[PDB]
Amino acid sequence: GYIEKLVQVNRVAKTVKGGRIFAFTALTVVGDGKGRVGFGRGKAREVPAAIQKAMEAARRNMIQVDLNGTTLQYPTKSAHGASKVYMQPASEGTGIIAGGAMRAVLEVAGVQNVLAKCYGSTNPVNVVYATFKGLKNMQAPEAVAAKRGKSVEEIL
RNA sequence: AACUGAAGAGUUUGAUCAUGGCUCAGAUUGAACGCUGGCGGCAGGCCUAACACAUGCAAGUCGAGCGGAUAAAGGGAGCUU
């Protein structure tokens, strides 16, 4: 589906000769409010056209996320580049408390109780990779129990 | 009766990623200063010169321990209040 959310806008450039050609980039994540997200990056020549391009690439190559219901399954920790990310599920009344670019991922996924923090280099185009290695590699235990459930899930 | 919280941003460049400094958003004080100023509860008030101090007051009490001297009421008498 489609619920859109913008994060970043830049002004990249390019020197040719004579002057300097400008261009705009944008980063936009799209989710469904249930656990299907997708991010997208587009470059164009103006703001109202660079956002439209980044929205279209978001709703291609999406991710199914197996959330527990407004929370996560377990504390995990993933990294990409020089960016390290930590996330652990929380109680009911606590909302989402994260920084800038992990709120926009964790809104549209539908989770509400995420309690996150990012270390290392804060790059909004690169902390998103650090988040999607984490969420796309969840497990959601298909087991008979948890304190007993290590005889039917390990064979899954 | 026993008991749960973790946010980032700006700045090196024609522009980008990284390393690395700096700076801001918070909660606090025996606080001082500037502008302004109705009320009441509960608190606190020399952090500097352990530097000198006028004048008041802050440890006395026992006559069921003993001398001594003050000697009432009253008992009076006497003399004339």
Side-chain angles (χ1 to χ4, degrees), chain A residues 1-19 21-156:
Chain A
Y2 52 102
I3 295 294
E4 287 84 3
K5 180 70 174 179
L6 184 144
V7 173
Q8 192 63 39
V9 55
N10 280 317
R11 185 180 70 189
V12 304
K14 183 183 185 292
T15 296
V16 184
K17 66 101 178 177
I21 301 297
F22 287 163
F24 289 158
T25 61
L27 179 65
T28 298
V29 62
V30 169
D32 296 340
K34 69 178 71 64
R36 178 175 291 174
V37 292
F39 74 105
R41 179 177 174 85
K43 185 191 286 184
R45 299 294 298 269
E46 64 181 359
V47 170
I51 301 167
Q52 294 175 357
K53 183 70 174 179
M55 285 180 181
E56 191 271 329
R59 62 176 67 93
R60 294 183 287 118
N61 291 319
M62 301 177 76
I63 294 99
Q64 179 59 253
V65 175
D66 300 331
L67 50 87
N68 203 4
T70 66
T71 57
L72 297 175
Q73 292 293 324
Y74 48 83
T76 187
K77 181 166 69 177
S78 296
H80 181 274
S83 293
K84 294 171 71 176
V85 164
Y86 178 76
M87 290 177 284
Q88 61 173 359
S91 295
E92 177 67 27
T94 297
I96 59 169
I97 41 175
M102 289 185 289
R103 298 184 75 254
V105 171
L106 296 174
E107 281 183 353
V108 297
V111 289
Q112 299 294 108
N113 301 319
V114 291
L115 193 70
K117 186 171 178 60
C118 65
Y119 300 106
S121 296
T122 303
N123 203 173
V125 301
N126 204 2
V127 75
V128 174
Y129 288 162
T131 304
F132 281 163
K133 286 184 68 176
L135 296 178
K136 186 255 288 179
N137 301 323
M138 284 297 174
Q139 296 301 111
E142 304 92 7
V144 293
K147 192 70 180 294
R148 184 258 169 275
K150 188 55 72 176
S151 294
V152 298
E153 176 59 32
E154 48 86 21
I155 55 173
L156 293 170

